[PDB]
Amino acid sequence: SVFLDKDFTFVVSSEADARAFVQFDPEHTVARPLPDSSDWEVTRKAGT
Amino acid sequence: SAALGEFAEKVTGPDGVLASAARLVLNQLGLSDVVTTPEAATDAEL
Amino acid sequence: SAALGEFAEKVTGPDGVLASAARLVLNQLGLSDVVTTPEAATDAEL
Amino acid sequence: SAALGEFAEKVTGPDGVLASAARLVLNQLGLSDVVTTPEAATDAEL
């Protein structure tokens, strides 16, 4: 178990999996709908 | 088919130059959160 | 104590410029493996 | 034969960008001297 010191590069994920991401971190993670593909980007900030 | 293959690589480089420089000026990318649309969607729902 | 603080940041930038440019020329960093020394160490042991 | 001729020139430029930037960070190139191998060669000779 390690704490991320600086924000990780965004990765593509499904809406169901990305909303889940938010349920753990939520101050520490960031998720957005990609308008064209309807999927979500998952970006882990510092402190994750 | 297209000889342009190295012109695709030449796009990637300045993107890195762009991205790195953008972080120095603290210009924030990927700032879109849940603020406006769903509230409007809630209003449009009512 | 030292006002040099922003001159530390100004070192980091070209390092990124250096590192990114180095990858383009395929100059390989962190190439040291187990090749010479231990064989010599084995020879020096005998 | 190969249209790549200007892509050879485009390699040279960043090399200059690489070399110039490398001197700023005081990263030393061409550091290999007589230290290890001949001593090992002397040991391997004995």
Short mmCIF file of C-alpha atoms in Angstrom, two decimals:
data_model
loop_
_atom_site.label_atom_id
_atom_site.label_comp_id
_atom_site.label_asym_id
_atom_site.label_seq_id
_atom_site.Cartn_x
_atom_site.Cartn_y
_atom_site.Cartn_z
CA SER A 1 0.00 0.00 0.00
CA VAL A 2 1.52 3.29 -1.16
CA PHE A 3 0.33 6.91 -1.25
CA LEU A 4 0.59 8.65 -4.61
CA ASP A 5 2.76 11.75 -4.25
CA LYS A 6 1.61 13.46 -7.46
CA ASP A 7 -1.42 13.10 -9.77
CA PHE A 8 -1.44 10.00 -11.98
CA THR A 9 -2.10 10.16 -15.72
CA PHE A 10 -5.75 9.70 -16.73
CA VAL A 11 -6.98 6.27 -17.83
CA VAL A 12 -10.13 5.26 -19.72
CA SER A 13 -12.81 3.34 -17.82
CA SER A 14 -16.50 2.44 -18.03
CA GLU A 15 -19.13 4.57 -16.28
CA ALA A 16 -19.99 1.77 -13.84
CA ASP A 17 -16.36 1.15 -12.90
CA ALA A 18 -15.46 4.85 -12.77
CA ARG A 19 -18.34 5.77 -10.46
CA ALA A 20 -17.02 3.01 -8.21
CA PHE A 21 -13.60 4.69 -8.26
CA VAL A 22 -15.24 7.81 -6.85
CA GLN A 23 -16.73 5.84 -3.95
CA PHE A 24 -13.32 5.22 -2.34
CA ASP A 25 -11.15 8.28 -2.95
CA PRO A 26 -13.75 10.82 -3.73
CA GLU A 27 -11.81 13.86 -2.57
CA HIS A 28 -8.72 12.18 -4.02
CA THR A 29 -10.05 10.86 -7.36
CA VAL A 30 -11.60 12.56 -10.36
CA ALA A 31 -13.94 11.09 -13.01
CA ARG A 32 -15.58 12.55 -16.13
CA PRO A 33 -17.92 11.47 -18.91
CA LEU A 34 -16.28 11.52 -22.34
CA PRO A 35 -19.10 13.06 -24.45
CA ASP A 36 -18.30 11.11 -27.62
CA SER A 37 -17.62 7.62 -26.26
CA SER A 38 -19.90 7.91 -23.20
CA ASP A 39 -17.15 6.28 -21.11
CA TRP A 40 -15.27 7.87 -18.22
CA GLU A 41 -11.72 9.06 -17.53
CA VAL A 42 -10.25 8.15 -14.14
CA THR A 43 -7.61 10.49 -12.70
CA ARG A 44 -6.04 9.81 -9.31
CA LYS A 45 -4.84 12.94 -7.52
CA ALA A 46 -2.16 13.25 -4.86
CA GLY A 47 -3.03 11.49 -1.61
CA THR A 48 -4.67 8.45 -3.19
CA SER B 1 -0.20 3.93 -47.77
CA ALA B 2 0.57 7.41 -46.45
CA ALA B 3 4.16 8.60 -45.96
CA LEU B 4 2.84 10.89 -43.21
CA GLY B 5 3.87 8.44 -40.45
CA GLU B 6 6.69 10.60 -39.08
CA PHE B 7 4.42 13.65 -39.18
CA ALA B 8 2.29 11.85 -36.61
CA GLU B 9 5.33 11.58 -34.35
CA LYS B 10 6.08 15.27 -34.92
CA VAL B 11 2.64 16.08 -33.49
CA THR B 12 3.27 14.10 -30.30
CA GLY B 13 6.41 16.05 -29.38
CA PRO B 14 4.95 19.58 -29.10
CA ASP B 15 2.00 18.01 -27.27
CA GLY B 16 4.51 17.03 -24.60
CA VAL B 17 6.02 20.49 -24.90
CA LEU B 18 2.49 21.89 -24.62
CA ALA B 19 1.48 19.70 -21.68
CA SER B 20 4.68 20.33 -19.72
CA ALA B 21 4.51 24.09 -20.29
CA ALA B 22 0.82 24.17 -19.37
CA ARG B 23 1.55 22.68 -15.95
CA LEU B 24 4.06 25.45 -15.27
CA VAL B 25 1.49 28.19 -15.83
CA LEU B 26 -0.93 26.20 -13.66
CA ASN B 27 -3.50 26.06 -16.45
CA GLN B 28 -5.88 23.36 -15.30
CA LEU B 29 -7.02 20.68 -17.73
CA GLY B 30 -9.72 18.16 -16.91
CA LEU B 31 -11.66 20.55 -14.68
CA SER B 32 -15.18 19.42 -15.62
CA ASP B 33 -17.21 18.27 -12.60
CA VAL B 34 -20.85 17.88 -11.67
CA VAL B 35 -22.04 21.47 -11.29
CA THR B 36 -24.27 22.98 -13.97
CA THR B 37 -25.87 20.45 -16.34
CA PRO B 38 -27.42 18.06 -13.77
CA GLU B 39 -28.86 20.99 -11.81
CA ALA B 40 -30.32 22.22 -15.09
CA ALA B 41 -31.36 18.63 -15.80
CA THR B 42 -33.05 18.60 -12.40
CA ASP B 43 -34.72 21.91 -13.24
CA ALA B 44 -35.64 20.64 -16.71
CA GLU B 45 -37.06 17.52 -15.06
CA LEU B 46 -39.36 19.50 -12.78
CA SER C 1 17.70 31.36 3.85
CA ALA C 2 18.66 31.19 0.18
CA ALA C 3 16.66 33.05 -2.49
CA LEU C 4 17.77 30.35 -4.95
CA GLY C 5 14.47 28.45 -4.61
CA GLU C 6 13.20 29.26 -8.10
CA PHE C 7 16.61 28.40 -9.56
CA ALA C 8 15.96 24.87 -8.32
CA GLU C 9 12.75 24.80 -10.35
CA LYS C 10 14.62 26.16 -13.37
CA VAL C 11 16.89 23.10 -13.19
CA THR C 12 13.96 20.68 -13.25
CA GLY C 13 12.54 22.02 -16.52
CA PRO C 14 15.51 21.38 -18.85
CA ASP C 15 15.88 17.99 -17.15
CA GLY C 16 12.44 17.20 -18.56
CA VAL C 17 13.55 18.76 -21.84
CA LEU C 18 16.70 16.64 -21.60
CA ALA C 19 14.90 13.41 -20.70
CA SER C 20 12.22 13.80 -23.38
CA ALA C 21 14.78 14.64 -26.07
CA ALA C 22 17.01 11.74 -24.99
CA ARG C 23 14.21 9.24 -25.57
CA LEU C 24 13.79 10.52 -29.13
CA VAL C 25 17.42 9.80 -30.02
CA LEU C 26 17.03 6.39 -28.34
CA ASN C 27 19.90 7.11 -25.96
CA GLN C 28 19.50 4.45 -23.30
CA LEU C 29 19.73 5.40 -19.64
CA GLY C 30 19.80 2.85 -16.85
CA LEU C 31 21.62 0.23 -18.91
CA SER C 32 23.79 -1.23 -16.13
CA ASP C 33 23.27 -4.97 -15.66
CA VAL C 34 25.19 -7.90 -14.23
CA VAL C 35 27.95 -8.45 -16.78
CA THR C 36 31.51 -7.42 -15.91
CA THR C 37 32.12 -6.78 -12.19
CA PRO C 38 30.74 -10.04 -10.73
CA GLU C 39 32.64 -12.09 -13.32
CA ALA C 40 35.74 -10.16 -12.29
CA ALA C 41 34.66 -10.65 -8.68
CA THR C 42 34.39 -14.37 -9.41
CA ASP C 43 37.84 -14.26 -11.00
CA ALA C 44 39.19 -12.18 -8.11
CA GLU C 45 37.66 -14.72 -5.73
CA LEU C 46 39.47 -17.65 -7.34
CA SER D 1 16.24 6.40 -52.93
CA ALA D 2 14.74 7.27 -49.55
CA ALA D 3 12.77 10.49 -49.01
CA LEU D 4 13.87 10.35 -45.36
CA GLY D 5 16.70 12.85 -45.96
CA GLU D 6 15.10 15.70 -44.00
CA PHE D 7 14.25 13.30 -41.17
CA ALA D 8 18.00 12.87 -40.75
CA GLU D 9 18.32 16.62 -40.26
CA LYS D 10 15.44 16.56 -37.79
CA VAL D 11 17.46 14.13 -35.66
CA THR D 12 20.49 16.43 -35.55
CA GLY D 13 18.56 19.37 -34.08
CA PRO D 14 17.33 17.79 -30.82
CA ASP D 15 20.81 16.26 -30.46
CA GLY D 16 22.06 19.84 -30.22
CA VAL D 17 19.15 20.59 -27.91
CA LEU D 18 20.09 17.47 -25.95
CA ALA D 19 23.82 18.24 -25.82
CA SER D 20 23.34 21.89 -24.84
CA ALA D 21 20.82 21.01 -22.13
CA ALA D 22 23.04 18.21 -20.82
CA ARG D 23 25.90 20.64 -20.21
CA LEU D 24 23.61 22.83 -18.09
CA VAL D 25 22.77 19.98 -15.71
CA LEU D 26 26.48 19.13 -15.60
CA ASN D 27 25.83 15.59 -16.80
CA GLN D 28 29.25 14.37 -17.84
CA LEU D 29 29.70 12.56 -21.14
CA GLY D 30 32.93 10.90 -22.16
CA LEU D 31 33.90 9.96 -18.61
CA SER D 32 35.51 6.59 -19.36
CA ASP D 33 39.12 6.38 -18.17
CA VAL D 34 41.60 3.68 -17.24
CA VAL D 35 40.28 2.39 -13.92
CA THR D 36 38.58 -1.01 -13.80
CA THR D 37 39.18 -3.21 -16.86
CA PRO D 38 43.01 -3.07 -17.01
CA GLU D 39 43.25 -3.76 -13.27
CA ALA D 40 40.97 -6.73 -13.86
CA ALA D 41 43.06 -7.54 -16.94
CA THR D 42 46.13 -7.41 -14.70
CA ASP D 43 44.36 -9.66 -12.21
CA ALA D 44 43.18 -11.95 -15.01
CA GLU D 45 46.75 -12.03 -16.29
CA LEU D 46 48.16 -13.21 -12.96
#
